Ligand binder design. Sequence first.
Ligand code: CL
Length: 252
Amino acid sequence: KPRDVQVLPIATNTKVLRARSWSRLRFEIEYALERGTTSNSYVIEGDKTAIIDPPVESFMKIYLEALQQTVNLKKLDYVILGHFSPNRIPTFKALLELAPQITFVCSLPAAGDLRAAFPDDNLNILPMRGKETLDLGKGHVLKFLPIPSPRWPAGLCTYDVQTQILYTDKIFGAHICGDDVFDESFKEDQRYYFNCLMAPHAIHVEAALEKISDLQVRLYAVGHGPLVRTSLIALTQAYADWSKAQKLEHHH
Ligand SMILES: [Cl-]
């Protein structure tokens, strides 16, 4: 099948765009189960509009086409980044051209990287250190929880108090492409994902879990795979169990 974008309302004023691929994006171990992947981006429309996590260059064209069909790019206020990677730069560059008014919202360690990627541009950047919130209006107050780790110094979770959705980007996902938007049995895929991408940073995973533990969450709006709804509590417990196990191995 060809790559496409799946768009669906998920909450009040909230939609997901899942850019889908039935084959690996890279020749790397995280795709080695050969089940494809999705890259998930989100749109919250309050008084102000924010997008969360625009995908890599590979999905850029179909992403922007779908986004243009969903929102008026001249009405776009914020682009929130769950982390920073150079393979997203071309997507940011296209967004900037189409919506020159946008403000980038990121964890502090990403701010420098952004400005360097657009050196002869004057970027609007709003770094979030964890104290300040961002009000989109209509109740959509965003809380920011930086989860810096050696792998993702600018790792950031975002929580919408109105919908109780936590945007977790790399945390809690799975590399699997299917028709189902929401999470059942891709437990194997979530576990493999943890082992590929989370396990080497187990003490930081634990720190992240502690940070989010006081939140009332109805959905993990993850960066890859099905959105974690009903399996949220069980997956969170699994991440905790898998993390303490890894710590045993790490020591030897
Ligand atoms: Cl990062």
